[PDB]
């Protein structure tokens, strides 16, 4: 048994885009997206199939870039932080659990970077 994926539809809540979730979606969601170090990130860690049996015990907070895609693509977030915050624990939960030498760790930082690089060109 893994967790549930998170949730990615928000029924009662009303659609209201803001600039900073379309660029959020359109410019940083879909550069980390097609870069070569996305795949790792691209849907929720399966500890399963991954052997990962510590892994839920360390990570009490499960996120990864389908769901954040999924949500911004649904209008899930209402405001750029909530999104940002998905960002934030994603690379997070890779550094808490991963040994520092290893390539999943040097990809996260990559794309970490450069969602840093774009984030740091938000519009308000
Ligand atoms: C320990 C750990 C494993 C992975 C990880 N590796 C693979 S290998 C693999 C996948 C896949 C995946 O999701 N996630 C999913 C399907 N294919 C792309 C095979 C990701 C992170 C962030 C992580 O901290």
Same mark, same amino acid.
Request: net charge positive; proline share 10%.
């Given at each position: 048994?893994?967790?549930?994926?998170?949730? &990615?539809?928000?029924?009662?809540?009303?659609?209201?885009?803001?600039?900073?979730?379309?660029? $959020?979606?359109?410019?940083?969601?879909?550069? $980390?997206?097609?870069?070569?170090? +996305?795949?790792?990130?691209?849907?929720?860690?399966? +500890?399963?199939? $991954?052997?990962?049996? =510590?892994?839920?015990?360390?990570?009490?907070?499960?996120?990864?870039?389908?769901?954040?895609?999924?949500?911004?693509?649904?209008?899930?977030?209402?405001? +750029?932080?909530?999104?940002?915050? =998905?960002?934030?624990?994603?690379?997070?939960?890779?550094?808490?659990?991963?040994?520092?030498?290893? =390539?999943?760790?040097?990809? +996260?930082?990559?794309?970490?970077? $450069?969602?840093?690089?774009?984030?740091?060109?938000?519009? &308000?």
């Amino acid at each position: 048994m893994n967790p549930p994926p998170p949730e &990615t539809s928000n029924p009662n809540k009303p659609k209201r885009q803001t600039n900073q979730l379309q660029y $959020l979606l359109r410019v940083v969601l879909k550069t $980390l997206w097609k870069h070569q170090f +996305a795949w790792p990130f691209q849907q929720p860690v399966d +500890a399963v199939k $991954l052997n990962l049996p =510590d892994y839920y015990k360390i990570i009490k907070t499960p996120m990864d870039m389908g769901t954040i895609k999924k949500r911004l693509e649904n209008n899930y977030y209402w405001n +750029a932080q909530e999104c940002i915050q =998905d960002f934030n624990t994603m690379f997070t939960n890779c550094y808490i659990y991963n040994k520092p030498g290893d =390539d999943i760790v040097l990809m +996260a930082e990559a794309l970490e970077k $450069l969602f840093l690089q774009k984030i740091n060109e938000l519009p &308000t």
